[PDB]
């Protein structure tokens, strides 16, 4: 069973996690990409709530603003839906689109906007007619995304990237340096999985901020 | 020098486990220095989202009671810290002996952090009791020592216990659930922690959510 990897395109930490997981696939590690919304997770309506009160997937994609709007809500929702539309063309195209859009945003420093989604679709080699047709199915894409957001909420996910190894071992994995060299990625992953499988039951390793 | 600084609060069973692991590793070649960080001060509403500490545990009367919730641990934790500073005036080995004795009284025997516990920890640690009594009379000096620890912790951004400062800018909270005293298992656990903090990937956080 593949490790579930919860990500948000907004996050450079999620970017580095997905890059490392992509390299690790080449070494035999299985990953399934799933979505967690930082905007939803951080919403004041959801703070200290046992049940989610505000869902990203309930929000209209019209003009930004209005009551309860939070910064990066529209671009992150749009990016997630575009990624679900891409994933309707299969697993490899899903990875290719997600990696492309991450790199456009974090390496090329482009906004998560329509031009960036179109460019990510080109780089992923999507069937553009099928992709347009799926993006017209906004309601269906929202239902897919909500299922990811629900699964993340059941685990208590609070940041990106969060890895669910199975067996009850789930953790946020925040690192600062892009790690794409294969042996460096394998070593980093071994440290993560060793921490979560330790019989000491390590719950947190966390640097403060001086 | 080069020991790892270990910030703890007697209130915390996570701090207890961290101190027990470090204590057994002292025999495997690892140096550690015990320092204090107050969880009550860290979680005080007046210090919330403040870059400058606004409320110090060391400014509070010895007999003062905190408010409800976690703040109620103000009095036991302040008194426990000062008793530990008094013990540490008898040297490094007596300091570890007193700190471990008091941790074990609180977390293994389930005793309150109260005067009977401080006395029993002093006897269990083999302190010179007349010297300990004399040092405990120096309330102002013990408060100055504690305040210096709390200042060092605040400069690093310490927020939880146990927090280990490896030097070289590598500092982290290390929270684990299972008591780990076996020398072999403690070495394995510590190597996970130091490998995480020294990795060139610059790992900042590994953290389980709560389902």
């Amino acid at each position: 069973q593949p490790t579930d990897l919860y990500f948000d395109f907004l996050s450079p930490y999620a970017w580095r996690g997905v890059e490392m997981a992509h390299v690790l696939r080449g070494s035999g590690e299985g990953f399934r990409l799933r979505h967690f919304s930082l905007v939803q997770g951080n919403h004041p309506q959801n703070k200290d709530q046992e049940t989610v009160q505000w869902w990203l997937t309930d929000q209209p994609l019209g003009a930004e603003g209005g009551s309860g709007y939070m910064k990066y809500q529209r671009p992150s929702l749009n990016a997630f839906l575009a990624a679900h539309a891409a994933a309707r063309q299969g697993e490899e195209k899903s990875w290719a689109f997600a990696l492309a859009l991450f790199r456009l945003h974090h390496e090329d420093k482009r906004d998560l906007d329509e031009a960036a989604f179109q460019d990510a679709a080109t780089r992923a080699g999507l069937d553009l007619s099928q992709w347009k047709q799926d993006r017209q199915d906004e309601a269906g894409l929202r239902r897919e995304l909500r299922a990811d957001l629900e699964a993340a909420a059941a685990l208590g996910v609070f940041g990106t990237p969060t890895f669910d190894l199975g067996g009850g071992d789930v953790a946020y994995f925040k690192f600062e340096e892009l790690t794409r060299d294969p042996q460096a990625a394998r070593d980093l992953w071994n440290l993560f999985t060793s921490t979560l499988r330790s019989e000491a039951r390590v719950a947190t390793i966390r640097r403060p901020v001086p």
Side-chain angles (χ1 to χ4, degrees), chain A:
Chain A
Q1 76 290 343
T3 295
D4 278 356
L5 192 172
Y6 293 83
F7 78 81
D8 191 326
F9 289 106
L10 296 171
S11 170
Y13 298 99
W15 168 48
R16 289 180 277 273
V18 172
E19 293 275 12
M20 156 202 92
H22 169 61
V23 174
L24 290 169
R25 288 183 97 224
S27 295
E29 291 287 339
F31 290 96
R32 174 171 61 169
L33 295 175
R34 310 201 67 176
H35 298 148
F36 167 77
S37 167
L38 291 166
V39 169
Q40 175 174 313
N42 281 334
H43 204 295
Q45 291 194 26
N46 292 327
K47 187 163 168 250
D48 298 323
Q49 301 281 353
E50 278 155 28
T51 297
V52 175
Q53 302 294 306
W54 184 100
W55 291 91
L56 188 73
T57 43
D58 291 343
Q59 306 310 311
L61 280 163
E64 307 196 44
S67 174
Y69 186 83
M70 293 178 70
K71 196 171 188 102
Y72 306 128
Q73 166 180 325
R74 192 170 74 181
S76 67
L77 174 57
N78 274 331
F80 280 139
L81 298 182
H84 276 278
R88 289 184 175 179
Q89 298 189 28
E91 186 178 353
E92 300 306 319
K93 283 190 177 331
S94 184
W95 281 87
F97 180 90
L99 291 165
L101 184 58
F102 266 125
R103 293 163 179 168
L104 294 169
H105 187 49
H106 294 284
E107 299 201 275
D108 301 346
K109 303 302 184 176
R110 294 177 56 179
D111 290 338
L112 294 168
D113 63 12
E114 182 61 20
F117 308 145
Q118 291 290 334
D119 286 352
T122 299
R123 290 169 185 245
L126 306 185
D127 184 319
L128 290 175
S129 193
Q130 185 56 51
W131 192 58
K132 173 157 104 171
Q133 180 159 294
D134 282 316
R135 293 182 76 203
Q136 288 180 333
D137 175 29
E138 178 185 308
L141 300 174
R142 286 173 182 272
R143 298 173 58 177
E144 293 179 13
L145 178 54
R146 180 192 181 104
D148 272 6
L149 304 184
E150 193 82 61
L155 298 173
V157 176
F158 60 84
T160 60
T162 292
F163 295 86
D164 176 6
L165 304 179
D169 288 330
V170 185
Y172 179 47
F173 191 17
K174 181 186 194 177
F175 56 98
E176 302 282 355
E177 298 299 323
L178 182 67
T179 301
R180 264 150 58 171
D181 173 68
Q183 190 60 50
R186 288 188 295 268
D187 290 343
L188 182 55
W189 186 242
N190 190 263
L191 183 62
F192 180 74
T193 60
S194 298
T195 299
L196 292 189
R197 310 281 203 204
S198 170
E199 289 188 326
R201 309 320 297 167
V202 176
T204 304
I205 293 169
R206 181 180 177 180
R207 298 185 192 258
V209 181

